[model samples]
Target chain A: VKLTKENIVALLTQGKDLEFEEDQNLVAFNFKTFCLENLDQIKKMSIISCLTFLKNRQSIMKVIKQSDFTFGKITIKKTSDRIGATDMTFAALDSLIRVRLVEETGNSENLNTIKSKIASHPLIQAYGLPLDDAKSVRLAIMLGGSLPLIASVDSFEMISVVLAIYQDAKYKDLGIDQKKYDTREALGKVCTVLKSKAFEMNEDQVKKGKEYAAILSSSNPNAKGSIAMEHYSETLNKFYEMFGVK
Target chain B: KVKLTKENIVALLTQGDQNLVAFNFKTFCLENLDQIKKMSIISCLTFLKNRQSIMKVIKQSDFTFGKITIKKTTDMTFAALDSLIRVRLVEETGNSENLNTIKSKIASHPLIQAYGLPLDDAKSVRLAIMLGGSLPLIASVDSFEMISVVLAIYQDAKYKDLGIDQKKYDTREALGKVCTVLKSKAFEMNEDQVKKGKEYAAILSSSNPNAKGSIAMEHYSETLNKFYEMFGVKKQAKLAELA
Candidate 1:
């Protein structure tokens, strides 16, 4: 009456009596073995439903000894513990900026200088890409706005401001009416949310000021200088509405 | 005088009125609210439009209005953001296990594969299972992600219609649980089979002699049957005659 993969499968599926007497050890072994083998298979399916793969790990360990080759080793280790795929995208972008600074100044030691140079750059400033807070704020607005049209729900990130920037680029050449059509109210909400979230993430007000300065200096064809004021007016109205303020 | 905090700025961008002067007072209020207000709405609208608050509403309204322009579509704005935060974070933190068994079964089961195959034709049956599990988390974003989740769940529930056991089925919960457990690489095998089988037998031998079949049921069926067959003990129905 030893446990086998089949028995565990039955218990899991058929609710076949799990508590058998003949060979209790084998019965336990079968359940333990199946769980260990299907760990990744379970997670790959979905953390939402297959999360039990984690709980069963500790339970099985209580019965099977490490030296016991009968069941096999059930330990796992990650190769890169530094970051996951989601954060890695940001790291890549950071490295790109760092490299550009290194190339420009020959010595990458002075971060402040490079920060200033990047700040003054026309494209970087125009897109509000100078600082983390501004970038995050920009991203919040983009996600908040694009929430309706974004094809994939899972891809919404603080980094989505980049996508908004990309979207703006596509329609920027279409003139004022086209641009207005492109920057619909919902998208504006999303952009604000992105920025708000960014601000929450980055608490440094000084850094925020520096980035804002850089962005203000950078010219945008859509902004036409007055665009800033227009944005401010609309944003204030939304703020009032959101807070129920008169 | 709204204090300059993240929340206040967000509120301003999201809900402010159309008055340019009032907008200037709130947005670039750092020093020159009045001077900024004098600017023409066209001149002011450019920068104001790009403000985080303005962008938030415009995009949300655009997505909503855009849907209705040709054929109205609803894109969940704040709902998706909040949803993504909760769903993805929970996804990061593992969850319930009992149901994961059913989730695992569905993942390994063949019927569900055939249905999702066309869309994810090249996806390994295993990958399809993972994608299916992640659907809820994805659906928190937009219509497309949500639609796929709805379809996958429907297909998974319908699977039991084809010879799937109903009593053991956790139709709604299995896949989601499986998703959580699969997060770590540690879950390897079934270790509780023997102990649980023993418990089952103890209950059976005391109550009904007919329950001997459970012995075979406890262990991997083929392996246990083979073990008992080695001793010339076959046919669980024999238990009724003699224990």
Candidate 2:
């Protein structure tokens, strides 16, 4: 209410809804302007951490679950805090579909845009290379980029289930109940295991790495390679049969 | 799908008399039951509100009334539908403005000025308004059926107005409306004036798009139609020789 960074953060840590303000000062309606003008003082760490947390969490229910978000030493479990975090952390990645989301044909301009944006973030800056490949994989899934690009981002850790939500009209509504069907969490638990043996033996047979990333990427995401893809009700033994591995 | 006809379309549009339908808008809906036919009355009203150019195909005669799909979103689809429906190219939803206000508007109008007519004084301005009004109406017909209704109030009257014949000027019925409006402060409207008003509304609507379908714009269509029916008819009758 004081429109200070302190007060706004106090409210936010308490999980008070900042986006909803009723009866928005209709007397000349300048109150929203007052909030916009003075509220830029929110450079505090808690709100900043919360935004990063929200971006990675990628769900409203997950982000709002914990009242207090800890960023380094300070905790943001309160209200009226001003955090100067721009929305690049929020809906910036949501609506900006102009990239057409794929960079496989070696056009790295948007790849660099995505790269530069990821590199420039204070969080990414704070934690240098050997970054979380899982989170980077999640970011790639959110980008809906081609699978080789995502696999490369993950350092060939795994391929995502070829991000189908919202971008692909035919695939998004595919009415299947696999947890990973709509999940961008990657086949990491299974892929990490799959690559440990089978992929290693087959690695040299294909020209290797991102080309193999593409091979796994080309697998029918709509149909299961096995039960692990259908959330361990899934057998990915189908790809094994195709590869003729007993 | 609810199959619709003429009166049914009007009844659906004039639903609840939400606003008095003006600018022949009711007639517009009736004419193109092709494009907007299947929509629920709500979707019908929204397409009218957006006033997008895709609706223009509805009026062109070549369209085979095959189906009613107002949601023809892409340009690619139109030529496809154009081939199927019969092919071919294509290409209000406002208010009463007054004289001095309306006249000042016309005098300062971009197209009128862009066309570069002479307007140094009120008399010259009135002259421009009249000539411009007639520009569209009597378009290029024959001699006798020129236009009507007014443009004589400047009292140079007694020289018997010299050779004054009633065939004075087909310059405009629109002028009769403007001068009729300039004095009485109402517009019967010349079609050119009607057109120039559209240009005005078109410009206004582009910038203030939200006003296009709301109650605020309804206040506008209300005034122009009321005065148009009032002043518009009387002047056409006044132009007849027997009257």
Candidate 3:
């Protein structure tokens, strides 16, 4: 079957149970794949910023599951085109953000400056964090886009921003051996630095982060190198080399 | 915007959309949909937000999910949450009732130990129920807590009055119900609308069918002393004086 935009929309709208004819097309629509593929772009996204997408996707999924809207039962062709730009969409997003913030911040008693400050830092972001809204959005896009045999243009754009950020050529000198360091280690370094920035760490934590970076940079058999992983390695090495303490 | 009703909640739940719950939840909040709020029940709004988890809870609760009234639906929701807590506790504690072993385990468990609850005391039981009864309320609890949780309920007025003729199975069914409630709240306890068990040692001492020197009373008394020991004589006296 020829996968086209119209057919994709048809599958999304009409296919009651979204069964794909070509199963490999599932990879294109996979959220984890998208995240892994664009690992470097997302690493640059602050724990807070990535959190926004992560939370947004989580909210969207919650909305979807709660409202009982089956993906293909309602044609998302138009909604997908809009990419959640409307007031209602924004309102939904805001509600989700509010819920997550309430959950994370807990009661006003614990919402001290320290907690809020820790929450906002980029260093807290890590790859393959358990669950989030951005992951949910990507899942939605993947599910929605799978019918088209490609991710939606919105999904592409969302990915492109992060891709561009990582692709920027300025700080390329932090030496990371891609064959040695896997994406997980690259992410570990990013988190290490961010955690340091958040806590204003002592020497112990600094050593721990450095040791962590070293461990991540060490030889590993699981390091799956793609264009995205390379960017992650470059970005990770650059970030740590500049900000890393002795 | 759909009016928030038990039917709507059930339909939204049954529809199984990952986004529907949040969409409806936001709409309900934005529009000030208060039918559920009026019930004064604890609702997650993001309740059933975790599809797989919620479904698991529903399955655990062993209750029919369709075409129920507001009151019964509220019962169902709590039942689901209760099942989750019960499941977590049992997994942590094991189904064994050995008081000595359970006491030792509770001593090692940080939360129960920190709370200073005795292995067999009523408050310890209540703590276990509340803790093991809901993860959203408290993450993890010990097996000692589970024994206490189940024992507290077994000693309750509700469990006794169930009218499950004690003549049949020679109290085996009654004994079975106690274990049944402990193992799965979704199965028997929640279905019967068994609320958290009340604290009543005097009732257990008098009413317990085990007349051969009351094993239940012995365990209860020993644990009660352990609790008093943890709190110290002054604190116990102070509590007693207030009581």
Candidate 4:
């Protein structure tokens, strides 16, 4: 099949696999070449809008699905010709950049905004809350500094927030050098501190707590709290009951 | 629990070689029968393997024997009796505490029976070759004994001079065999045995210190220390005390 800009757009719109030649060249070489030639026509968008779009790529899947993406007079639709749709995406990004949407110092505000948005995200908010009082003890030890910020959250939510921070990728993009942060050691210390805190439960209490934790961790999350509560340690049984709700 | 019967104990020791029966059955049975009967089969096998120590114990009369007898085939005990018979620990004769009878049987065993061959440069080479033949088997009693045989030949000045001058066989190979055997056996040895082996190694390494064919003293000392280390003994100075 002859390669062209329209075909590249069509393939991308359909999420079709790219074709390769015997020598390993992309069969869509012509499509890529056409995009390169049209660079001048494409270079019109405000740089800040382009950066925002690129930075928010993870969230764009939802925007794309909704067909709300736009550029000047151009728009994308599921039924639209692939090349036309792709052209609109590029054109919108280009024009927005050329229209002077750049912001150099406002990035600090953007960083804080993004951080607060992530902290309040549904998944993050739910995970940041404690599951029960037992986990509250662990959260106090492991997530001590973040405690005041998430003071209202339960134990599971606290753990979720810590785990969520580890999952977020924007730190590197925000001028943060990943190498400067020993993430594994940081997480290791967190776990060690929380574990030591858990161990501080008197020997008998810790033993009961661990036994209950094992039972709770292994049981179906949807199981009735009363089923596993039969174990002797009433404190741990209640702790596990909280974990079940989480 | 299948009781550790005289026949079963003997069988456990020697893979059940009928001709291999313990001497002084009465003494042997009295010393070991009760313990063997109580012990599981796996434990009985271990008793057989360490039978040599049991022999030493009997010689010292650590336990009093009573009602010694050989009439009943089922009377054989597991302690040293089963292993003694299995390894021909006693002579072919079914009675006697004499060491010569035991020594003669060991001297005739297929493993090192070859050691009785005439001592010469040729046999030294053959012995070295034999020792290296099965590296894994070097941990056996046969292998440990063969090491001394090789050393005896190496320590002989006349044989050494003749072997070196005639170039009949490389004495270095013999020295290498000594080192290799001690090294392989080191893994299976306990702390005490490895200590003893280290002493032998020190002496063997120094046998011809300046000679071209001799093992390097440094290599010998280091390897000996490593041998001790392999068996979990860390004190090099303590091992060196045997030197």
Candidate 5:
């Protein structure tokens, strides 16, 4: 009868399908306190629906208290409470920097070099590029902070990040509805999915992707569209070659 | 965490055919909780959209076809043959000589031939005989016009050079089977098409018939050479001036 914590825990423990509004209200619970109190129940339940409620960095960061817990797409700034369309979520950004930084920054000289590179980002002077990570982190964050893809992908590597770079570089100037553009999230998802498994694509998918790529890349030739096709093709081919296809 | 490939979504597209009443599209969409959660929000909305046109397009892209051939059969002929046997001059009919009298009486009957026309025409013949209690002395009028298609070809004097004999109709078992319309093409011939086909048959029927009819169908210009070589019909007019 009531949206009480005990009732909520009982409802979740039943682990049944949540009603649309039910999931929303369930999500509206005391974010950190409820998670801390029901850590076991939370772990036991399917927390997928919570992703809707855990919209911002502040809420998602709270649930990462468990050492084994994992989350995709962290914010560039802790203070920034909202994730705007222009933002990139760090799926493994923490790990990418942590593991590599641990080894590479172990030396005092390299650590100093990294710090120096960030402060003097060559692009800031020439108005152009990453320590390469620190600068990329800076450039990507700075450029990505407000309409990231409008500029070229100077040192970005992930397939989706680059595609968004090329995508906005071409589409930002055109007459595009921001709403439809956001709904057209397949470009990023497609890139996300294919990043690891491009070689596993079947004939129909491959053909469709080729056609989609051609259409998306057609006009951008004078734009980064040139790199769009080449790099997209390059990404696919390398994965395929690794898996005996290309 | 979005481990899904484009194919995983595409497979689900067909797994529960989103359109037809048979598929459990909703259950199939949420079958894997992790999949639903991990899949791109954009793709989730994309695949789950009304699922109707998407079902139709997915179907259009999926099947295979090859050139095929089918047999033509006449149901009217079988119907008539049965009744003709029922009302025979004898007490019986048989494969015993197929009809010493039994077969002879009905095999060549005009009623039998007329009844062989397409269902509606032969149906008229049967309906006619059924009520009147009469037998066809001649092929039904429409049946005769249809028969003329074969007559215009096999019985034509022009084919006499090819040793054309009228009995080729009986010999070829074409009397009932061959009609003014041909079934060889992709679609059944309509009225205009039937008349044109008959016109083509007309050229082969002439002794000195329209010289161009047969050749025109083939786009051949010289019917004269053959006519002259066989019967000395003068090479006719259209090209007569040019030569």
Candidate 6:
């Protein structure tokens, strides 16, 4: 019942009901503050990872069953403890995931990379981009400039339907969704504060790689990309659902 | 919507009882309806609340109204509603306040435009207060005539010292009754401060045949009719004569 900073941090970690991230991202920081300020609600809503992964797994398993999740040796690990599994392990794993989920869009290389990609796109140069488009890129860049908020099937589907009108060519008719982008900004600010207490993703995307390594800790080396993105998608989904946008 | 000012407040205050009662506000208001009709009630009321010196600064930056909606929000309190009514009235009339005189008048007292509140009613309230314990006065052309008549009587030497000449009036000794009621504060003056004022009626029984032939005389005669009716005179004999 008592919530110390430790308990507060627990609610902010990845598996909590409230999707807060303790990170440098301004959006994430603001989101964390909002959650911390409303800590009681966040604590009440806190969902354990086992429950969440099951819910997410339930949905994903429908599309691609447990066999699909475990295909090519990507298996879910269950271990019988000496007596029983400690809450400590869950907390540890949660902290590890918290570290990995820190979005790293701030590598100057990543910024330059996306900027160049857009500049070279034949559409971006000849026609001036829409204000909404510029706002989107600006917002995306500002929000770590990597991993667009629409990084999931359901979210991407919704965003794609909306952007289809304006996504004529990302270059030709560069449209932007200001409201969605702002909503994302509001949410990102909350997530940042939640993730910072544990380890965080480095500029090299270090914590992320290691965290993904843990998700794939039981698997071989080449199992990185797909599992990593999958974890990121699920983590981001928690955020989306928590915010009511999903 | 137009902003509020002091002039609007004073005018509204000057309006008669009905309107002030409609808004559930009765403080130092005049019972005269013309003042409310002719002046901007909202602006004057706002002015009374916030003097010009303070309001001028706000006028530059504040949105003419901040969600000054008349539709009423579920969470707003009664005090908030009054505030909204005033604010919304200003918002509705804020733009192009100077397009015309009537509009200027309307924008100033924008409440009249919003809630069907008439200035005439505001006038009666003010007049009733000024009339003291005499009786409630209705705001109409006749009322204006009656007011002018009283003012005329006040101006005359013969009637100057004596208050509200009760001698010429014989039918029930009206002013005598009024003077006694007023002096004694006999009746519990309710919202309009008007008791069955019909008792001291002033109806003009005669018309001039020559009044139709000359416009000047017709106007003068009409003015008298207005005055007589305004003061509720049953006969011309009830009126005081000029030297």
- lDDT (tens digit, per residue) of candidate 3 on B171-201: 3222233333323322222312222322322
Could you tell me which 10 consecutive residues in candidate 2 chain B have the lowest summed lDDT? B86-95
Q: Assess chain B of each prediction and give its TM-score.
A: 0.19, 0.18, 0.22, 0.23, 0.18, 0.16
Tens digits of per-residue lDDT for model 2 on A23-79? Answer: 544123222232233222232222222223323433322332323333222233322
Q: Decide which is better by lDDT, 5 or 6.
A: 5
**Model 3 segments more than 4 A misplaced:** A1-57, A63-67, A70-246, B1-118, B121-123, B135-243
Better of 3 and 4 by TM-score: 3
Candidate 1 CAPRI classification by DockQ: incorrect
Candidate closer to the true structure by DockQ (higher is better), 1 or 4: 1
Candidate 5 TM-score for chain A: 0.22
Q: Candidates' DockQ values?
A: 0.01, 0.00, 0.01, 0.00, 0.01, 0.00
Give the C-alpha miss distance for residue B70 in model 5, angstroms: 27
Select the stronger candidate by lDDT from 1 and 5. Answer: 1
Per-residue lDDT tens digits for candidate 4, residues A135-193, read 32232122212211121122222242353244233343222233345444445544444
Q: Global lDDT of each model? A: 0.32, 0.31, 0.32, 0.35, 0.31, 0.28
Backbone clashes for every candidate come to 135, 32, 29, 26, 6, 70
Candidate 2 segments exceeding 4 Å error: A1-68, A72-246, B1-243
For every model in order, the TM-score on chain A comes to: 0.21, 0.23, 0.19, 0.23, 0.22, 0.19
iRMS values in order, in angstroms? Answer: 29.7, 35.6, 24.5, 37.2, 27.8, 39.8
**Every model's TM-score:** 0.16, 0.17, 0.21, 0.16, 0.17, 0.15
By TM-score, rank the candidates, best first: 3, 5, 2, 1, 4, 6
For this target, which candidate reaches the highest TM-score against the unseen true structure? Answer: 3
Which lDDT tens digits does candidate 6 get at residues A1-246? 234577667777747564334442323212223323333422232122222322232232232211212211122232332233222222222222212212222454433434543433223332332222222322222221112222221112222222322232231223233422343443353334324344233454444334332322232212122222233333223323322333
Q: What TM-score does prediction 1 earn?
A: 0.16
Candidate 5 local lDDT, A122-175, one digit each (tens): 222222232244323233223221122211121222323443544555555333
Compose the digit string of candidate 1's lDDT tens values, residues A1-246.
346678777777885456544554433222223333434433232221111221222222222221111111222212243334322222222222222222233343433433433344333434444344334333222321223223122223223333444445544432323422454543465466555445343445445434433443343434223332232233223322322234
Q: Pick the candidate with the highest lDDT.
A: 4
Cα lDDT tens digits for candidate 2, B140-237: 11110112122221111111222223334322222332232222322234455434433322222222112112335566876766777877543333
